């Protein structure tokens with residue numbers, strides 16, 4: 346129950362009753378004011394509120410951003426409208442220790458861009474994964490309907506593929522038939538947008554020929570240890586000793602032979618050659634390692 350503000354302090358041109366603006370467009374809401382000279386040194390605040398919440402304020406009397414409030418004329422200016430700018434706006438002229446002067450409210454409606462939020466992207470699913478999900482959400486005016494189809498010659502979603510009420514594409518017990526290009530369509534009266542994404546099915550490496558040991562030999566003998574892998578993408582193999590990689594850069598080049606088929610052959614075995622040798626198999630999907638003990642008998 347604060348005292349009323351003086352009559353010469355007033356909002357001359359408040360916001361328009363209703364504005365409709367397209368997302369991406371600039372706009373501005375008005376709050377032209379008259380500030381009498383006998384208050385120029387008082388604490389006077391011009392505030393803009395959105396849905397009842399303070400949004401911008403500037404002191405009018407005593408002591409590149411997208412959304413700014415201009416001191417001289419009270420304009421709330423939007424350099425570019427975004428969907429969340431929609432709401433009910435009101436400006437206030439507030440002298441310290443007095444009742445605020447309230448403008449009429451102004452409704453700001455935004456014609457939203459038809460677009461995905463966010464835009465679906467390509468995914469790699471693990472073979473035999475129990476559940477895998479690909480979200481699809483869009484905005485627009487009105488809110489668009491979202492659906493999934495398969496791209497290409499056969500548009501039907503494979504078995505154990507479904508779309509839930511949120512537009513989420515769901516794969517159950519991922520198998521090789523799930524691989525393909527899948528299209529999310531968002532449709533309303535503004536048109537239709539189409540995000541097609543690659544859904545690949547990958548397989549972490551597995552040993553087809555794992556290293557097998559213990560490998561026992563005598564000094565000056567020759568040993569071989571094997572490593573071959575399968576997977577999708579085609580895995581690479583890498584030899585280590587005690588988790589330290591092995592190559593020509595750190596082994597005797599006339600004794601250690603790294604064959605193309607994954608086999609490691611050690612000629613003229615020495616006592617120091619003993620230890621734990623490992624093969625790591627890897628692709629873009631994952632990694633595995635298996636090790637073997639090399640025993641050198643005196």
Ligand SMILES: *[C@@H]1O[C@H](CO)[C@@H](O)[C@H](O)[C@H]1NC(C)=O
Pocket residue numbers: 373375415417418419420
């Ligand atoms: C208020 O002043 C600013 C700064 O010059 C200007 O950009 C804006 O257009 C003005 N408001 C109106 C409604 O003209």
Ligand SMILES: *[C@@H]1O[C@H](CO)[C@@H](O)[C@H](O)[C@H]1NC(C)=O
Pocket residue numbers: 499500501502503504
């Ligand atoms: C299209 O794909 C579905 C789902 O995998 C399958 O059941 C159907 O037989 C396919 N149709 C043709 C003509 O290949």
Ligand SMILES: *[C@@H]1O[C@H](CO)[C@@H](O)[C@H](O)[C@H]1NC(C)=O
Pocket residue numbers: 509510511
């Ligand atoms: C849809 O999303 C909401 C969250 O907005 C969640 O609570 C609900 O469980 C989801 N529905 C399904 C079927 O996943």
Ligand SMILES: *[C@@H]1O[C@H](CO)[C@@H](O)[C@H](O)[C@H]1NC(C)=O
Pocket residue numbers: 524525526543544545
């Ligand atoms: C998707 O389309 C691209 C381009 O046509 C093609 O190379 C690819 O094999 C298709 N399928 C997947 C799973 O990416």
Ligand SMILES: *[C@@H]1O[C@H](CO)[C@@H](O)[C@H](O)[C@H]1NC(C)=O
Pocket residue numbers: 494496528539540541
């Ligand atoms: C979706 O867009 C792709 C291009 O990315 C196109 O090849 C495909 O035919 C479109 N699908 C539909 C149902 O419009």
Ligand SMILES: *[C@@H]1O[C@H](CO)[C@@H](O)[C@H](O)[C@H]1NC(C)=O
Pocket residue numbers: 554571572573604606607608
């Ligand atoms: C790799 O090739 C070498 C030489 O031909 C052979 O001795 C070895 O057994 C091969 N490894 C496997 C796992 O076949």
